[PDB]
Write an enzyme that holds these catalytic residues in place. Structure first.
Site: not given
Lengths: 144, 197, 72, 72, 72
Positions: B101, B144
């Site tokens: 990620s 995020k």
């Protein structure tokens, strides 16, 4: 070793020693994958099976004397062991949940300041223990 | 209520040689991981710490090569593949987000160890990685940016092809976060460490 | 339909500097395989990444050998 | 071997032997998993099961002739 | 073998053979778990069923190739 036993004399918990000499691989310390007959946990988990509690007085034997013929260090895993929070991140080669060594008290036994691992130079204060005087040897002699 | 459980603003990055914060992923509400990379003089081997994934080691090979192509971009040492073993500390390892990620975060932190130069703070990032220095796009950036909004982080940097995902979500969180578009890992290098080399 | 997810009948890639694309057959129907090859100053060793069988080393050895007949 | 036997004459209790050649399993030393028919104690325990009183003189023949192999 | 057969001629005994190269347990020449049929005794005991005398000449074949893999 008797000094660590004396720390255990202070705290009234279970005591243990196990060699970090005689290690050349991570999969001795942890188990092996279940990939052949006889997949058993390594030195650590069975060493915990030696201890009736999750708070012992642990001595580790010959931390300055190890080996690893492969990737990384088990001394990295000794930093993992040393940290109770990294025992919630402690890698397992046979089991699959990171076993917690929080209340497991930590003092180790070594002989060298030269060969100590760089991943374990943090969180360690190297205190030189001197030898013994003829006067001291006689004192220990006639007393103990 | 007594004691807080949760942290203030970035007080463990604190722009640093050894550590760097990076946004992370759970489908129950996102998080962010400060990865800790230390450059220790050794023989050039590799380590992994955090019950990790091997693909992180792979991206370390990749970003390692990216360092090996651009040392004079940053004055970086010309041999550490035989001189420095690396104890990368990511937290909890191989992500259920299958594979990477925030490979760019790992590359910045590993470059930070090879530089022994401090990071920057109040910046968070996440992205996918490649050999030729091409940051590859991510999907579903909301978690995020949610947790960074919860982290009080307002400079958050993204891969360049995700720029059309600005046009879908409520902008009121978005404009309250500062954007500097990147396509390359060296861009988040020169926008993430405190010195240029 | 929102933003376009792909290239419109692919027309640009800013042509290949160090890579190349590969027709295969995945059994759900094949795909492009853009291969990445990285070249450092090293020591004559070999690195294969991307879950490859030994057949890829053999092909790589062969291809490298063909180049070794084709340097000048 | 005769030193063991003659001491056994002297203290007047039964001599025995068990080799330590060849054994590589710790479960060959210890029991076997009492979890189906076919589990055995170690030949140390079998050698205890030969002598019918709880104070013998066991000889360990060539204790440096085992090895460190699997199952402990 | 015919050496031993000449001997068995000479000594009024009924000669037998049973090979040994290719057993790895004490369960075939030893007894099995006598709790089901299939517990058949030794090859030697098969011979003692065959031979009618309590004093036979039992040729023992190929002991160099007999091993032990299963415990016992």
């Amino acid at each position: 070793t008797s000094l660590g036993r004396s720390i255990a004399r202070s705290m009234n918990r279970k005591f243990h020693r196990i060699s970090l000499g005689g290690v050349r691989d991570e999969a001795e310390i942890r188990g092996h994958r279940r990939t052949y007959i006889g997949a058993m946990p390594g030195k650590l988990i069975h060493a915990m099976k030696q201890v009736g509690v999750i708070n012992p007085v642990i001595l580790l034997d010959e931390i300055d004397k190890m080996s690893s013929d492969w990737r990384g260090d088990p001394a990295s895993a000794m930093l993992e062991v040393l940290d109770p929070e990294q025992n919630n991140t402690f890698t397992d080669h046979y089991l699959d949940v990171p076993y917690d060594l929080s209340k497991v008290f930590f003092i180790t036994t070594a002989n060298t300041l030269q060969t100590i691992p760089r991943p374990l130079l943090d969180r360690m204060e190297v205190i030189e223990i001197p030898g013994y005087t003829n006067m001291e040897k006689q004192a220990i002699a006639r007393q103990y | 209520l007594g004691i807080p459980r949760y942290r203030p603003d970035k007080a463990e990055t604190e722009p640093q040689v050894g550590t760097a914060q990076g946004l992370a992923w759970t489908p129950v509400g996102g998080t962010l991981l400060t990865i800790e990379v230390a450059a220790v003089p050794g023989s050039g081997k590799l380590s992994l710490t955090g019950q990790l994934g091997e693909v992180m080691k792979e991206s370390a090979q990749a970003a390692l090569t990216y360092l090996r192509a651009h040392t004079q971009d940053y004055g970086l040492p010309e041999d550490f593949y035989n001189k420095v073993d690396l104890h990368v500390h990511v937290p909890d390892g191989a992500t259920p987000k299958d594979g990477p990620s925030a490979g760019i975060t790992m590359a910045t932190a590993i470059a930070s160890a090879l530089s022994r130069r401090p990071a920057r703070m109040d910046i968070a990032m996440t992205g996918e990685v490649s050999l030729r220095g091409k940051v590859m796009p991510i999907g579903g950036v909301k978690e995020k940016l949610l947790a960074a909004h919860q982290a009080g982080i307002h400079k958050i940097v993204l891969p360049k092809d995700n720029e059309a995902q600005l046009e879908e979500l409520p902008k009121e969180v978005l404009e309250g976060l500062e954007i500097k578009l990147v396509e390359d890992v060296g861009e988040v290098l020169e926008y993430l460490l405190l010195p240029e080399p």
